Design a protein around this motif. Structure first.
Motif, PDB file in Angstrom:
ATOM      1  N   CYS A 108     -47.103  39.107 -44.869  1.00  0.00           N
ATOM      2  CA  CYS A 108     -46.628  37.950 -45.616  1.00  0.00           C
ATOM      3  C   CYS A 108     -45.363  38.246 -46.413  1.00  0.00           C
ATOM      4  CB  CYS A 108     -47.727  37.457 -46.558  1.00  0.00           C
ATOM      5  SG  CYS A 108     -49.181  36.820 -45.710  1.00  0.00           S
ATOM      6  N   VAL A 109     -44.262  38.543 -45.727  1.00  0.00           N
ATOM      7  CA  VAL A 109     -42.983  38.781 -46.388  1.00  0.00           C
ATOM      8  C   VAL A 109     -42.187  37.483 -46.338  1.00  0.00           C
ATOM      9  CG1 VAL A 109     -40.848  40.149 -46.354  1.00  0.00           C
ATOM     10  CG2 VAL A 109     -43.054  41.230 -45.827  1.00  0.00           C
ATOM     11  N   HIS A 110     -42.227  36.712 -47.420  1.00  0.00           N
ATOM     12  CA  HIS A 110     -41.704  35.355 -47.443  1.00  0.00           C
ATOM     13  C   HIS A 110     -41.266  34.907 -48.841  1.00  0.00           C
ATOM     14  CE1 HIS A 110     -45.538  33.728 -49.006  1.00  0.00           C
ATOM     15  NE2 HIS A 110     -46.105  34.637 -48.236  1.00  0.00           N
ATOM     16  N   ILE A 111     -40.931  33.620 -48.943  1.00  0.00           N
ATOM     17  CA  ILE A 111     -40.083  33.057 -49.992  1.00  0.00           C
ATOM     18  C   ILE A 111     -41.044  32.495 -51.044  1.00  0.00           C
ATOM     19  CG2 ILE A 111     -38.172  31.359 -50.421  1.00  0.00           C
ATOM     20  CD1 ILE A 111     -38.628  32.612 -46.884  1.00  0.00           C
ATOM     21  N   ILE A 112     -42.327  32.408 -50.671  1.00  0.00           N
ATOM     22  CA  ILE A 112     -43.380  31.875 -51.595  1.00  0.00           C
ATOM     23  C   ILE A 112     -43.000  30.452 -52.046  1.00  0.00           C
ATOM     24  CG2 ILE A 112     -44.973  32.538 -53.442  1.00  0.00           C
ATOM     25  CD1 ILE A 112     -44.804  35.050 -52.373  1.00  0.00           C
ATOM     26  N   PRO A 113     -43.097  29.424 -51.173  1.00  0.00           N
ATOM     27  CA  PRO A 113     -42.821  28.005 -51.555  1.00  0.00           C
ATOM     28  C   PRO A 113     -43.965  27.445 -52.396  1.00  0.00           C
ATOM     29  CG  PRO A 113     -43.566  28.081 -49.294  1.00  0.00           C
ATOM     30  CD  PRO A 113     -43.453  29.511 -49.720  1.00  0.00           C
ATOM     31  N   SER A 114     -43.731  26.307 -53.056  1.00  0.00           N
ATOM     32  CA  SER A 114     -44.777  25.680 -53.908  1.00  0.00           C
ATOM     33  C   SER A 114     -45.764  24.882 -53.041  1.00  0.00           C
ATOM     34  CB  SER A 114     -44.164  24.809 -54.973  1.00  0.00           C
ATOM     35  OG  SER A 114     -45.147  23.974 -55.570  1.00  0.00           O
ATOM     36  N   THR A 115     -45.286  24.287 -51.944  1.00  0.00           N
ATOM     37  CA  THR A 115     -46.152  23.464 -51.065  1.00  0.00           C
ATOM     38  C   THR A 115     -46.894  22.441 -51.902  1.00  0.00           C
ATOM     39  N   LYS A 116     -48.166  22.181 -51.579  1.00  0.00           N
ATOM     40  CA  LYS A 116     -48.966  21.234 -52.355  1.00  0.00           C
ATOM     41  C   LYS A 116     -49.487  21.859 -53.647  1.00  0.00           C
ATOM     42  N   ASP A 117     -50.321  22.889 -53.529  1.00  0.00           N
ATOM     43  CA  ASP A 117     -50.740  23.665 -54.685  1.00  0.00           C
ATOM     44  C   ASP A 117     -49.855  24.895 -54.778  1.00  0.00           C
ATOM     45  N   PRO A 118     -49.282  25.215 -55.969  1.00  0.00           N
ATOM     46  CA  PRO A 118     -48.319  26.327 -56.090  1.00  0.00           C
ATOM     47  C   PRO A 118     -48.832  27.694 -55.658  1.00  0.00           C
ATOM     48  CG  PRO A 118     -48.052  24.888 -57.950  1.00  0.00           C
ATOM     49  CD  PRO A 118     -49.176  24.291 -57.114  1.00  0.00           C
ATOM     50  N   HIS A 119     -50.140  27.924 -55.797  1.00  0.00           N
ATOM     51  CA  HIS A 119     -50.736  29.135 -55.244  1.00  0.00           C
ATOM     52  C   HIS A 119     -50.714  29.111 -53.720  1.00  0.00           C
ATOM     53  N   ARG A 120     -51.199  28.020 -53.125  1.00  0.00           N
ATOM     54  CA  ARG A 120     -51.372  27.911 -51.676  1.00  0.00           C
ATOM     55  C   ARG A 120     -50.063  27.465 -51.027  1.00  0.00           C
ATOM     56  N   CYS A 121     -49.248  28.449 -50.656  1.00  0.00           N
ATOM     57  CA  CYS A 121     -48.038  28.215 -49.877  1.00  0.00           C
ATOM     58  C   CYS A 121     -48.389  28.229 -48.385  1.00  0.00           C
ATOM     59  CB  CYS A 121     -46.948  29.220 -50.238  1.00  0.00           C
ATOM     60  SG  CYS A 121     -47.261  30.923 -49.873  1.00  0.00           S
ATOM     61  N   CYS A 122     -47.372  28.460 -47.542  1.00  0.00           N
ATOM     62  CA  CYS A 122     -47.503  28.410 -46.081  1.00  0.00           C
ATOM     63  C   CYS A 122     -48.575  29.361 -45.544  1.00  0.00           C
ATOM     64  CB  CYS A 122     -46.146  28.720 -45.441  1.00  0.00           C
ATOM     65  SG  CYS A 122     -46.098  28.633 -43.634  1.00  0.00           S
ATOM     66  N   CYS A 123     -48.799  30.486 -46.227  1.00  0.00           N
ATOM     67  CA  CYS A 123     -49.938  31.336 -45.893  1.00  0.00           C
ATOM     68  C   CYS A 123     -51.268  30.668 -46.223  1.00  0.00           C
ATOM     69  CB  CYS A 123     -49.821  32.669 -46.624  1.00  0.00           C
ATOM     70  SG  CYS A 123     -51.132  33.857 -46.275  1.00  0.00           S
ATOM     71  N   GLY A 124     -51.515  30.362 -47.498  1.00  0.00           N
ATOM     72  CA  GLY A 124     -52.741  29.715 -47.915  1.00  0.00           C
ATOM     73  C   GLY A 124     -53.569  30.476 -48.932  1.00  0.00           C
ATOM     74  N   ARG A 125     -53.167  31.689 -49.299  1.00  0.00           N
ATOM     75  CA  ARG A 125     -53.844  32.449 -50.343  1.00  0.00           C
ATOM     76  C   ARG A 125     -53.286  32.042 -51.710  1.00  0.00           C
ATOM     77  N   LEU A 126     -53.577  32.841 -52.735  1.00  0.00           N
ATOM     78  CA  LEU A 126     -52.966  32.645 -54.044  1.00  0.00           C
ATOM     79  C   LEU A 126     -51.570  33.257 -54.068  1.00  0.00           C
ATOM     80  N   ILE A 127     -50.720  32.728 -54.963  1.00  0.00           N
ATOM     81  CA  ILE A 127     -49.281  33.019 -54.941  1.00  0.00           C
ATOM     82  C   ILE A 127     -49.006  34.479 -55.280  1.00  0.00           C
ATOM     83  N   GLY A 128     -49.746  35.025 -56.246  1.00  0.00           N
ATOM     84  CA  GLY A 128     -49.605  36.439 -56.557  1.00  0.00           C
ATOM     85  C   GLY A 128     -50.209  37.332 -55.490  1.00  0.00           C
ATOM     86  N   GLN A 129     -51.174  36.802 -54.733  1.00  0.00           N
ATOM     87  CA  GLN A 129     -51.809  37.583 -53.677  1.00  0.00           C
ATOM     88  C   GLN A 129     -50.914  37.697 -52.447  1.00  0.00           C
ATOM     89  N   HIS A 130     -49.875  36.868 -52.360  1.00  0.00           N
ATOM     90  CA  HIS A 130     -48.971  36.932 -51.221  1.00  0.00           C
ATOM     91  C   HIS A 130     -48.040  38.127 -51.366  1.00  0.00           C
ATOM     92  CE1 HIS A 130     -49.992  32.495 -51.026  1.00  0.00           C
ATOM     93  NE2 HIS A 130     -50.430  33.006 -49.892  1.00  0.00           N
TER      94      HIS A 130
END
Lengths: 101, 346, 91
Positions: B12-34
């Motif tokens: 998961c080397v990415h830009i960490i978008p906000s998407t719908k819930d700020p934790h759940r970006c395009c991956c789907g885990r928590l934002i700090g867990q990415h």
């Protein structure tokens, strides 16, 4: 087709309690026949640590078919057995007699 | 160190978008867990997890070789993994068990005959049972069929399952190179991440770089199943190893899987079984009044429209959309063998 | 057959040279023990860990065999076949 099933099931649902209260009834009755098919059912929510605590009670009351039933449902013996829990197993007084003392 | 130098887990080397819930970006885990390239920007790197799984819990002690791969791993590089490193002989049978993902309680008679049915067909031919792998849906019933047989007889039914790495419960517990990590078979009811069924002997766990998202397995199973059938058996008469698609229940998606197998070259037959429900019973009720395939009269056509719009709760327009697929499936009814539950069907 | 075990184990620990020449081996023992004290019994194989996995999983196979045959011999003996047939004819 059996009043034996009809009494014991009506005690389980008539209490209507959570799963560890229900399992402790069947353990006291030594009846895995009702614990297999109603208490351990699909979707039945088990609280955190209720299965591990009921495992401690099942060993000290010498109920060999309950230990098989809970293990088939999980309760990994690798994660249950600690030093403090094993010491409680040698210091139980319930169950058959012993020459340990 | 062959497996450590051949496949690649994608990370998961990415830009960490906000998407719908700020934790759940395009991956789907928590934002700090990415910490593919569309918003997950994923980075292929040698596999962090491959080895053996000791299924602690559930009694019934089983070992299961597990390998994390991407969906871009070549199917020839997969076959080198199964034959040499996993030490598995090339099967004479490839029973793909594409089915429903949500749990479906079947009839007790159905679970018994689907039990002894999929097992003895696996033993006697020496088959690889290509299921999903996570302990929901049809895969839970196949694991219970395996649970019956491992307590009566000795044959090791190889049951290679391509399940998502992103969806397996306690995925960090199975991280490690050539290490036998014990895996607890506990399913927390609250956790959306689902445990692996303990009675599989082999797991290709499929990495789409996200978490809680199906889809990497869909491409990887089919690219693998082609390349199985391209390898020939040692009968030397010119015989590719036969691939079948045993399908029970099934969501509305699995009808397009049926058309993707019947219209494919060669036509992988389907042993769609009625009596379970959903997709399998509307393909079977379709197969009963086929005549010449899509030669269904308009009254039982609209009887198909309603059953797609009620058992799958589809809209009236999209029930016609799935009946378009169902009519094109059914013009090759001759490969769609339907096991009739009980009754007279086999 | 059970007292053969005493015979291999004692003679393995016995000295090399015969009794009339065991005095040379005994003075070797007392000189070595004097030097090492100024500075376990049995014949074990001492297997390495990856061989210990093979020996252990071999044994987990034989546990799974034992109980199986036990259950098969019970459920195919004449005593249990007549018992089960009697009960299902009751039903």
């Amino acid at each position: 087709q059996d009043i034996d099933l009809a009494i014991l099931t009506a005690l389980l649902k008539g209490a209507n309690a959570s799963a560890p209260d229900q399992l402790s009834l069947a353990l006291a009755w030594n009846r895995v026949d009702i614990a297999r098919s109603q208490i351990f059912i699909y979707g039945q929510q088990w609280p955190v640590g209720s299965l591990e605590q009921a495992m401690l009670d099942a060993l000290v009351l010498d109920r060999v078919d309950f230990v098989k039933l809970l293990i088939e449902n999980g309760v990994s013996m690798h994660r249950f057995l600690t030093i403090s829990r094993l010491e409680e197993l040698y210091n139980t007084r319930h169950g058959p007699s012993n020459t340990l003392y | 160190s062959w497996i450590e130098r051949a496949f690649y887990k994608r990370e998961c080397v990415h830009i960490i978008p906000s998407t719908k819930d700020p934790h759940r970006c395009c991956c789907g885990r928590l934002i700090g867990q990415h910490v593919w390239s569309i918003s997950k920007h994923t980075q292929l790197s040698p596999t962090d997890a491959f080895g053996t799984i000791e299924f602690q819990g559930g009694g019934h002690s089983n070992k299961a070789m597990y390998v994390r791969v991407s969906f871009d791993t070549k199917p020839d590089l997969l076959l080198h993994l199964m034959t040499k490193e996993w030490q598995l002989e090339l099967p004479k049978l490839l029973i793909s068990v594409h089915g429903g993902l949500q749990n479906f309680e079947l009839q007790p008679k159905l679970k018994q005959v689907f039990g002894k049915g999929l097992i003895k067909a696996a033993m006697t031919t020496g088959a690889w049972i290509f299921t999903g792998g996570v302990n929901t849906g049809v895969i839970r019933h196949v694991g219970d069929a395996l649970k019956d047989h491992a307590s009566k007889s000795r044959g090791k039914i190889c049951t290679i399952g391509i399940a998502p790495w992103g969806i397996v419960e306690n995925q960090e517990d199975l991280i490690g190179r050539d290490v036998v990590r014990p895996y607890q078979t506990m399913s927390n009811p609250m956790s959306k991440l689902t445990v692996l069924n303990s009675m599989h002997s082999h797991f290709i766990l499929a990495d789409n770089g996200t978490t809680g998202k199906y889809g990497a397995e869909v491409k990887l199973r089919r690219q693998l199943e082609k390349h199985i059938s391209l390898q020939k058996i040692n009968t030397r008469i010119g015989q590719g190893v036969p691939v079948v698609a045993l399908i029970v229940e099934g969501g509305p998606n699995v009808i397009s899987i049926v058309l993707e197998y019947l219209r494919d070259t060669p036509p992988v037959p389907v042993v769609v079984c009625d009596g379970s429900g959903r997709a399998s019973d509307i393909l079977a009720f379709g197969h009963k009044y086929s005549e010449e395939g899509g030669l269904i009269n308009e009254s039982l056509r609209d009887q198909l429209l309603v059953t797609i719009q009620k058992t799958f709760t589809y809209t009236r327009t999209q029930a016609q959309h799935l009946f378009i697929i169902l009519m094109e499936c059914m013009k090759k009814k001759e490969l769609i063998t339907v096991f009739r539950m009980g009754s007279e069907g086999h | 057959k059970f007292q053969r075990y005493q015979l291999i184990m004692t003679f393995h620990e016995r000295p090399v040279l015969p009794p009339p020449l065991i005095i040379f081996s005994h003075m070797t023992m007392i000189f070595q023990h004097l030097c090492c004290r100024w500075r376990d019994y049995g014949l074990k194989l001492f297997i390495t860990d990856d061989e210990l996995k093979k020996v252990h999983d071999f044994e987990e196979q034989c546990i799974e065999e034992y109980f199986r045959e036990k259950d098969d011999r019970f459920n195919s003996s004449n005593d249990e076949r007549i018992r089960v047939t009697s009960e299902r004819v009751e039903n």
